Each structure stands twice: as C-alpha cells, then as structure tokens.
Amino acid sequence: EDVFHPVRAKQGMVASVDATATQVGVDILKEGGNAVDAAVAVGYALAVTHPQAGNLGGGGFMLIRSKNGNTTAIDFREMAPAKATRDMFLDDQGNPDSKKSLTSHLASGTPGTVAGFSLALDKYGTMPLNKVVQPAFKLARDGFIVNDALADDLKTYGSEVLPNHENSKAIFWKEGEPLKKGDTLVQANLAKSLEMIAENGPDEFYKGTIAEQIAQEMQKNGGLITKEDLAAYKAVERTPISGDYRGYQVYSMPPPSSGGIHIVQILNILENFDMKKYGFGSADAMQIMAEAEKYAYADRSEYLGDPDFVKVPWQALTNKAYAKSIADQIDINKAKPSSEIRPGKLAPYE
C-alpha cells in the first residue's frame, strides 16, 4: 500500500547520518543506557566517523523529553571570543570578508559540544562520561573504512580547506590526495584527546591539555580563542519554545536558535488553512506555505539574537492573533514580493 516503509523496532531506536555512529547508539541502548546516554555516545562517535559535521570543536542544540513529559533544551552553542569585536570581519573598505569569517583562525567560536554533552549526561544521563566516549575512542585509535559519503565530502569540500593546514592535511590527505573510499582513517591525536576527556572529564577540553592546544593554535595564527575563553564557556539549559498545531504540541529550540520560534510561527499561520484539503504536492498547499514562510524569515532578521544579550519578542512572534493577522495577508491565487514584506508590527501582541 505504501511506497515507502519505516524501519521498525520494538524497544529502542537511533537515527543518524552515519551507520557506525547509529550502531554505537544502539549498542549503548542495549547495554541499558537511556536516550541521553545513547545520544552522547552517538555524538562522540560522529566526532570521529563524520568529521564533516560531527565534532568536539563545534557546537549545537539538544532537545530532551523524558518519559514523564518533562521537556527541556540544552544550548551548547559556541561563544564568540572575549576579544571578538563587531567589525572584526570587515576589510579596509569596511566590507565583510567571507574568507576571514569562514577560513581564517578568526572564524572560530569557543566550542560548546563537550560542555553541552556533559551537562546533559550528568543531569539527564545514567552512564559515566568514560563509558559513552569509549566507542568513539576505539574508532579514532583503530580507525575505520572511508565510505562514499566521507570520500565524496573530502574531495568536494575538504579539498578547499584541509590541505591548506599542515596538521589537517597530515590526517585527512594521503599521497597528495583526499582519502578515497576504501582507505582507512586513523586519528591518533583525536584518540588521545578523547582518551583524556574520558579520564579528566570535560575540563580536559576547557582547561586541560586540549585547551592549551586550542589556545596555542589560535595565538600562533591570529586567532582569538584564549584559555580564559575556554574556561569561561558554559552550556545553558533553556526553556523550549513550543506551540499547538491542530491538537498536537510542538517543541523546538528557543534562542540563540531561531529554529523553534519560526517553526511555531509558521504552523500558527498554516493552522488557519485546511491544508489537508489541498493535499501534498498541490498547487495551493505550496502557495500558502511559501508565503507564510516569508514573514517568518523577515522577523528572523530583526528579532532574533542571543537572549542573554537581546530581548526576543517570542511571545508576540508565537502569538496566534499575530499569526492570524499574517494569514489574512495571504492570497491563494497571487503572491507578494519579498520587497513588500517587512518585520511585522508586534505592538498589539506584546
């Protein structure tokens, strides 16, 4: 009957971009770990098998919902360096230099992944950090086979940055070329880092050897991340943004992410239509949705920022009254140029 069928399981399940990492997640669940434990193990596993995005030197968000309904969000997003400045990415003419914000040592923010994972693990997990990091440790120490995804990413995107730095090239390049499908990727240095974290906890990263290595890498190349930055970093548990769509409650990430707010905003807008009637792929459904999104991105550019620095009008943005007023400016048989759309007037919704 269906053309597409979901994978089925009766006890636990993990879905991720990498087969090895997913399997790491499942094995942890089978050992009696909880969703959070598995999630941290998967996160450390990806930092090794999916260096494209999985990481220890990046950041992100996490939404946790207990079996009892308790829903919370962990913000382990990166903090700009204390010595970071407003116009730091401007050239002499005062124009944004993409190279500076994407490839130089100035593009980096103090990483929050280790922090966020440990916060979630200590408060919501049940396994010690050393146990959930072990799978990733072995993968880095003993290596793994490069698959199509990694091989393709190394060639297409890796080529533009990895071979330009000696330590990076030594790890991901082989015989003057990016590792190919079938080659083995061993990350001895990462294994040592992982091994140290599993032993001295998250401080190994923000205060220990790893912190030193990060600070020196920046200092010797014009970066700003100092040991004070790494020591002054902290993951932050925040209240999820949520809404109600046709009787279903939706929970997502609140600022610093703009994710939560706008997904809810658009759903509120859409609620004012009989979407089901139009059906998937229909001309109408695509019409309505395309327009609703416009207003959201408009508001995004204006009202969204680190809540610890700016006040976001999230109540008004997710206010159904406002959403209903946005819905009316929508014509099922005619669009509205992004030019004739500006950040909404949240006044009567404050």
Binding site: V17, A35, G57, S301
Partner: protein
Amino acid sequence: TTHYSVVDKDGNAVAVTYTLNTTFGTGIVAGESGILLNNQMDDFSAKPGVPNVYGLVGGDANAVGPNKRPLSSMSPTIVVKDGKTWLVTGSPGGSRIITTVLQMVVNSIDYGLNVAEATNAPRFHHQWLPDELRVEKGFSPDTLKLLEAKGQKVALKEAMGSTQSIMVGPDGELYGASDPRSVDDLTAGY
C-alpha cells in the same frame, strides 16, 4: 550540519543538531589535538544588511559581540500527540533547517504520511531573501506552472536537508526513517 534522534525502551527521547557550520568548518585542526575547528562566527551578521554563507541577514540583534552566541537555525524538534512523544526529528541545512522540519511536521499531521513517506517526499523553501521559491526535483511540471503563474519564481536546486527521524506508535512501537538525500546513513533499533 548533522542531526540525529534517539528514543529508548522507556520512551525517553533526545533530538540533537550540532555542527562545525560549513563542511569540515575552517578545515583547521587545533594543534596536535586532532580536533577540527568550526567557522560558526559566520552565523553572526558581519555587517547589518549583508547576508552570510546561507543568505541569512541580521542587524544589531545578531551582530558580532564578545562572549555572544551567534544566531542559529538548527531545530531539533519533538511533536506530541495525545500527550505522548510522537515525532522526533530535525535536519541540517542552515537556513533551510526551518522549512525542512516544518514539512516533516505538516506531512505527518496534515497529510497523514508515515515517517518514511514524510521523509522521502520532495521539499520546497522560501527564506524571503533571496526572493525565490527554491525547490527540489520531484514536483510535477504542471503544479510548477501554477506557482510561476500564481506569481512565484520557482528555482530548482540542490537537495535540501538530511532528516533522521523516529515516530512513536501509541503502543510504544518505534518507526524510523533516514533521509534518501544522505548516503551511508542509518536508522536502526532493536
């Protein structure tokens, strides 16, 4: 970008979206740590009115500042039905993370598609600026005439996102789906 979801035997659930930002970030390994460094600083508004790598714009709210966390679009998400965790999803895609998650939710609730169907369905997206109705291959030539007609400027492009989702049956049974757009991925359980 990458997102993963987990649900255990007790019904606890976690959705995580994390990244270095662009693929491999700056491509700079921090000394002998073996750790690649992110280029998340580009998510800040380098200059009010000027778009970043994803075409996203900002002002003073998202301008560069010390100890400030740059604006993100990552959306690990959880939908609840009849008071119970029902859908756990999310996806990479910079600015498209928002409309990608949105379509997963709309596909599940409004069109009654199973998590695999909802995942394999074609996607579209509009971020105000640039002004265009970005689409993926998979939408009928006919339906597309109406968008161009009704007024939209359809712009076919690269596949959007990599949803990794799990749906929870009323009886505790788990249903999952990995995105066709990402190869070598996996949704497994026991």
